[PDB]
Design an enzyme around this catalytic site. Structure first.
Site, short mmCIF file in Angstrom:
data_model
loop_
_atom_site.label_atom_id
_atom_site.label_comp_id
_atom_site.label_asym_id
_atom_site.label_seq_id
_atom_site.Cartn_x
_atom_site.Cartn_y
_atom_site.Cartn_z
N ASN A 1 27.33 49.28 49.82
CA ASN A 1 27.06 50.16 49.62
C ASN A 1 26.39 51.11 50.39
O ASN A 1 26.07 52.52 49.58
CB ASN A 1 26.17 49.60 48.74
CG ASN A 1 25.35 48.68 48.24
OD1 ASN A 1 25.42 47.85 49.07
ND2 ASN A 1 25.62 49.00 47.00
N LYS B 1 22.89 46.52 50.61
CA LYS B 1 23.42 46.12 51.79
C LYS B 1 24.34 47.29 52.49
O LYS B 1 25.38 48.15 51.83
CB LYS B 1 24.36 45.00 51.50
CG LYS B 1 25.74 45.54 49.87
CD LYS B 1 26.05 43.52 49.56
CE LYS B 1 26.69 43.19 48.90
NZ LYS B 1 27.34 42.53 48.27
N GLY C 1 36.67 45.39 38.44
CA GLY C 1 37.91 47.04 38.41
C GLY C 1 37.87 46.81 40.05
O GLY C 1 38.07 46.52 40.67
N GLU C 2 38.05 48.12 40.25
CA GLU C 2 38.92 48.89 41.11
C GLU C 2 38.20 50.47 41.72
O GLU C 2 37.51 50.89 40.25
CB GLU C 2 40.44 49.00 41.45
CG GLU C 2 41.29 49.44 40.44
CD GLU C 2 42.57 48.52 40.55
OE1 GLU C 2 43.09 50.28 40.97
OE2 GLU C 2 43.20 47.69 41.29
N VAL C 3 37.86 50.67 42.58
CA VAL C 3 37.71 52.74 43.59
C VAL C 3 39.03 52.82 44.15
O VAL C 3 39.76 52.12 44.31
CB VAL C 3 36.47 52.04 43.77
CG1 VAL C 3 36.14 53.23 44.57
CG2 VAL C 3 35.12 51.77 43.70
N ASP D 1 27.66 52.22 44.91
CA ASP D 1 27.90 50.54 43.60
C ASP D 1 26.40 50.65 43.53
O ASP D 1 25.37 49.69 44.54
CB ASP D 1 28.41 49.93 44.83
CG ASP D 1 28.38 48.25 44.53
OD1 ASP D 1 28.62 48.50 43.94
OD2 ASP D 1 29.11 48.15 45.04
N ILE E 1 41.34 52.02 47.46
CA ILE E 1 40.26 51.93 48.21
C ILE E 1 39.72 51.29 48.48
O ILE E 1 38.59 50.35 49.14
CB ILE E 1 39.47 53.32 48.82
CG1 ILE E 1 39.09 53.85 48.18
CG2 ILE E 1 40.60 54.15 49.19
CD1 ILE E 1 37.29 54.88 47.89
N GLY E 2 38.66 50.48 46.95
CA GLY E 2 38.25 49.22 47.08
C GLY E 2 38.66 48.39 45.04
O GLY E 2 39.14 49.02 44.52
N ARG E 3 38.53 46.82 45.36
CA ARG E 3 38.82 45.92 44.47
C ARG E 3 38.11 45.24 44.44
O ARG E 3 37.14 44.63 45.76
CB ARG E 3 40.52 45.61 44.05
CG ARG E 3 40.96 44.88 43.97
CD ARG E 3 42.24 45.50 42.88
NE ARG E 3 43.27 45.45 44.43
CZ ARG E 3 44.48 45.78 44.10
NH1 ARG E 3 44.60 47.29 43.28
NH2 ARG E 3 45.01 46.16 45.31
N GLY E 4 37.69 44.42 43.39
CA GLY E 4 36.88 43.25 42.78
C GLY E 4 37.19 42.89 40.97
O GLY E 4 38.45 43.82 41.02
O1 LIG Z 1 31.97 50.07 43.59
C1 LIG Z 1 32.49 49.85 44.76
C2 LIG Z 1 32.97 48.38 45.19
C3 LIG Z 1 33.29 47.68 43.92
C4 LIG Z 1 34.96 47.99 43.78
C5 LIG Z 1 36.03 47.30 42.28
C6 LIG Z 1 34.77 46.65 41.30
C7 LIG Z 1 33.51 46.54 41.47
O2 LIG Z 1 32.71 46.66 40.89
C8 LIG Z 1 31.80 44.58 40.42
C9 LIG Z 1 30.56 45.01 40.64
C10 LIG Z 1 30.49 44.92 38.73
C11 LIG Z 1 29.18 43.42 38.91
C12 LIG Z 1 28.07 44.20 38.92
C13 LIG Z 1 26.99 43.11 38.47
N1 LIG Z 1 27.16 42.06 37.07
C14 LIG Z 1 28.71 41.77 37.66
C15 LIG Z 1 29.41 42.41 38.04
C16 LIG Z 1 33.08 46.98 42.69
N2 LIG Z 1 32.76 50.67 46.06
C17 LIG Z 1 32.16 51.96 45.33
N3 LIG Z 1 32.64 53.24 46.49
C18 LIG Z 1 32.17 54.39 46.17
C19 LIG Z 1 32.84 55.27 47.02
C20 LIG Z 1 32.51 56.29 46.55
C21 LIG Z 1 33.17 57.43 47.38
N4 LIG Z 1 33.94 57.15 47.84
C22 LIG Z 1 34.80 56.59 48.12
C23 LIG Z 1 33.77 55.14 47.86
C24 LIG Z 1 31.25 54.44 44.78
S1 LIG Z 1 31.08 52.52 44.67
#
Ligand SMILES: O=C(Cc1cccc(OCCCC2CCNCC2)c1)Nc1nc(-c2ccncc2)cs1
Ligand SMILES: O=C(Cc1cccc(OCCCC2CCNCC2)c1)Nc1nc(-c2ccncc2)cs1
Lengths: 394, 394
Positions: B199, B196, B84-86, B212, B78-81
C-alpha cells in the site's frame, strides 16, 4: 478532442430540449426508485442494496424538487377521465396558476401514453401570445403536472352559452383562432381537434389555445399519416373521419374545416351537422354537400355564409389549401375596428370583470392506485423526461 | 426556505463533486438502467421496449462522449489480482501518463463483494493530501470500474525492502511518513485496517503516498468501525469475523509496528507457513513476539515495536498521534515532523522516462475475451451497485 467531447457532454446536460439534461436524469432515478421499492423485488440484493444506498438522497431530491404539496388547490375548474385541471396558488411565491393533472394509472390502462409530449413542448416553447404558457412541468408516482398561466375569462363554450354571439364578435374570435392556428402550423403541428373547449380567454378577453392532446408534428410535405380518426364528432373533417390507414394522409387544412364549424356554431347557435345521436352527426358530416343548410333567418350575412361554405367543403377546394393569406383576405374579415397585425392590441368584445386573482366565475362548478408488482414492470418509464424545472428556457 | 433557495440548493447538488445526484451519478443511473434492461426477454414488456427505443440514439452518443477505456493507451500492467489489475496508461488525446486501476464487475457480483471501492474512490478523489495518491478520473462500462490516478514511479515498500537491508535511519523516515500518512486518513474520518508495504508507494522524489484503500472504512460518531492475508492485521480486526467487534484507528498503529519490525528484522513478526498459523500467532502476540539475537535493533526501535505490538487498550496511539511522534525512536538531526516531506528521501528514484516501470515487477501474461454475465430472463440489476462511481476532476 478532449475539451470538445467534455463541452458537447456539458451542453447536453444543460439543454432544455435534450433527452439527457438534469431534469430527465433526475426523472430516471426517481422512476427507478419508485418502480423497484416493493417487497417482492426487494428480495433481490442488487435492488435492496441500491434502494437503501439511495434512501436518504431520494428523500432530499423529492423534498427539494417541485411537488404537488407546494401548491394550494383553490378550485377544480376542469375534469376528465384522464385527469383534472385546477386553479392553484404556489404556497411559497403566492403566485396563481392553472395546473393540469394527468393520471398515470389511466394512461397505462389502454395503450395511451405519449400524447402529452407535444402539449408539453407546444406550451413550453411556443413563446406566442396565442398559446397558453407552461411555467413548470413535474411528476410523482401517480400524476403528471403542468403548471400554466391561468386564463380567467373561461372558454368559448361558456361564452356561447351566455350570449347570442353577434357577427362583429364572431369576426373577432374567428380572426384570433385563424392567427392562433397559424402560430401552431408555423411550429410544424396540426391541431386536429380545434373546438370552443380548447379556446380560452385571458384577463383582457383575448384568445389563447390550450389542450393539445391531439397535436401531431407534420412531415416534410406538411402532412400527417394517421390510420385511426382523431377529434370530436361535431368538428371532425370528412378526410380525418374516413381515414383508414391504407389511405389516411392529410394536412393543416383539416383545422380550417373546424374554424368553419366554430363560425357556424357562433352565428347559428348549433353545430352544422348536429343530430339527436352521434352516429347521425357522422352521417351528416359525410354528406356535408347536402346536409349544410342555414336557417330562414336573415341574421347571417352574405360574407359569413360564404366563409362557412368556403371552409365546410372537400379539402381539395377548401379555403386555406393555399395558405393563411387567402383566409385573411376573405371579405368576412373586412372591418374598421382592427387589423390582422394589431388585433391582439385592440379592446376585446367581452373584457372579463374579475373580483380577484383567484376568480373562477367563468368556470362551471365541479383515486385508483397501481397494483403492487411481483416482478419489474416499469410503469414509471414512459413518463421519464416530462419534468420542465431544472433545465428551462428563459 | 424560499422557492429560489430550494431551486439553487437543487442546482448546487447537480454540480457538487461530493453529491450522490450530480450529473456524473445521474448519467450512471440511466447508463446502468439501459444496460440492465436491453435483453430480449425484458424487451417483451412494452414499458421497457419503448423506453430503450426512445433513449437508443441518446445513449450511444453519451457512451461515445463520456470517458472510456479506449481513450487510454496501456503501456504496461504493473499490478494484478483476482478482482482486477493496475496498469501504466497514457491518455491518447492529452498524452498524459497515469496509473489506472480496473475492478471486475463480474468478480465483484460473483464473490458477493461489490461495496469496498467507495472509500478508495472518496479518499483518492477528495483527500488533497501529499500523503494520498490522487484520483483524477473515475469511470465505468458494463464490465469494469476504472480509477485514473497519479503514477508513483518509485514503486512500493515491498520492492524497496527486497533490494535493501533497511538501516534504522531509513526505517525511521518511512515509519514517520506512514504515521503522518495514516493521520491524514484518520483526520478524513477513515480507518485503513490493512496498512502494509504493498500500500505504501513512492513518488518521483522517494516520498511516501498511500494507495489501495479496499479495506478502508468510515468511522462512526465515537470514531469506531464494525465489520463482518492476516500478516499486518491487528487482533481486533481479526476478532471481528461476524460483526462481533468495535474498534478504532489504533488498529492501524499495530500495522506500523509490524512494518517497522519487518524493515529491521527482514520478516513479519507473526509469519507462519499457513494463513491460519499467522492468525494464531497474532492472537498469541504476548508470547509469539520475539526479536533475533542480532544486537542490530536499537533499544528505542524495540520499545516502539513493543509499544505498538500490544493489546489495543495499552497500545501507543490510543491517546493520539502526539504520543507516537514524541517517541524517542523518532529523535534525530536530519528532519522534523512538520517539514519531513520537504527533506531529501533516503532513496531518490533514478528514472529514464515518464513511462519508466523499473520499480515494478514484470507480471505473467493474461489475455483473451469472455468471462461475462449470463443473459437474464428477468430484471436482476447487476449494474445497480456501481451507480455513482463516475468522477471527473476540474
Ligand atoms: O491496487 C493495487 C493492488 C491491486 C491490483 C489489482 C487488483 C486489486 O484489487 C484487489 C482488492 C479487492 C479486494 C478488496 C477487499 N474485498 C475483496 C476484494 C488490487 N495496487 C495499487 N497500485 C496503485 C498505484 C498508484 C499509482 N501508481 C502506481 C500504482 C494504486 S492501488
Ligand atoms: O385540458 C383540459 C381538459 C382536460 C381536463 C382533464 C383531463 C384532460 O385530459 C384528457 C386528454 C386525454 C386524451 C389524450 C388523447 N387520447 C384520448 C385521451 C383534459 N383543459 C385545459 N385547461 C387549460 C387551462 C389553462 C389555463 N387556464 C385555465 C385552463 C389548459 S388545457
Amino acid at each position: 478532442s478532449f475539451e470538445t467531447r467534455f463541452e458537447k457532454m456539458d451542453n447536453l446536460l444543460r439543454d432544455p430540449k435534450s433527452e439527457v439534461n438534469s431534469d430527465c436524469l433526475l426523472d430516471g432515478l426517481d422512476a427507478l426508485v419508485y418502480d423497484l421499492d416493493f417487497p417482492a423485488l426487494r428480495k433481490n440484493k442488487n435492488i435492496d442494496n441500491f434502494l437503501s444506498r439511495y434512501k436518504d438522497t431520494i428523500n432530499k431530491i423529492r423534498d427539494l424538487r417541485m411537488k404537488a404539496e407546494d401548491y394550494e388547490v383553490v378550485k377544480v375548474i376542469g375534469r376528465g377521465a384522464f385527469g383534472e385541471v385546477q386553479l392553484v396558488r404556489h404556497k411559497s411565491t403566492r403566485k396563481v396558476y392553472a395546473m393540469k393533472l394527468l393520471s398515470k394509472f389511466e394512461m397505462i390502462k389502454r395503450s395511451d401514453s405519449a400524447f402529452f409530449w407535444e402539449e408539453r413542448d407546444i406550451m413550453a416553447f411556443a413563446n406566442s401570445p396565442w398559446v397558453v404558457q407552461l411555467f413548470y412541468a413535474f411528476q410523482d408516482d401517480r400524476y403528471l403536472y403542468m403548471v400554466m398561466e391561468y386564463m380567467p375569462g373561461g372558454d368559448l363554450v361558456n361564452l356561447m352559452s351566455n350570449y347570442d354571439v353577434p357577427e362583429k364578435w364572431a369576426r373577432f374570435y374567428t380572426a384570433e383562432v385563424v392567427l392562433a392556428l397559424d402560430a401552431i402550423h408555423s411550429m410544424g403541428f396540426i391541431h386536429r381537434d380545434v373546438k370552443p373547449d380548447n379556446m380560452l380567454l385571458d384577463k383582457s378577453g383575448h384568445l389563447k389555445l390550450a389542450d393539445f392532446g391531439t397535436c401531431m408534428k407534420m412531415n416534410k410535405e406538411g402532412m400527417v399519416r394517421c390510420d385511426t380518426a382523431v377529434g370530436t364528432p361535431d368538428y371532425i373533417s370528412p378526410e380525418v373521419l374516413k381515414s383508414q390507414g391504407g389511405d389516411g394522409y392529410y394536412g393543416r387544412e383539416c383545422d380550417w374545416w373546424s374554424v368553419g364549424v366554430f363560425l357556424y356554431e357562433m352565428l347559428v347557435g348549433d353545430t352544422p351537422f348536429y343530430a339527436d345521436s352521434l352516429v347521425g352527426t357522422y352521417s351528416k358530416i359525410m354528406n356535408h354537400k347536402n346536409s349544410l343548410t342555414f336557417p330562414d333567418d336573415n341574421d347571417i350575412s352574405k360574407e359569413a355564409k360564404n366563409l362557412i361554405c368556403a371552409f365546410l367543403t372537400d379539402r381539395e377546394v377548401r379555403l386555406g389549401r393555399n395558405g393563411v393569406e387567402e383566409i385573411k383576405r376573405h371579405l368576412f374579415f373586412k372591418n374598421d375596428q382592427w387589423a390582422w397585425e394589431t388585433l391582439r392590441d385592440t379592446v376585446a368584445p367581452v373584457v372579463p370583470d374579475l373580483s380577484s386573482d383567484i376568480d373562477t366565475s367563468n368556470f362551471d362548478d365541479l383515486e385508483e392506485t397501481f397494483p403492487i408488482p411481483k416482478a419489474f414492470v416499469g410503469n414509471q418509464l414512459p413518463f421519464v423526461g416530462f419534468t420542465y424545472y431544472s433545465n428551462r428556457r428563459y
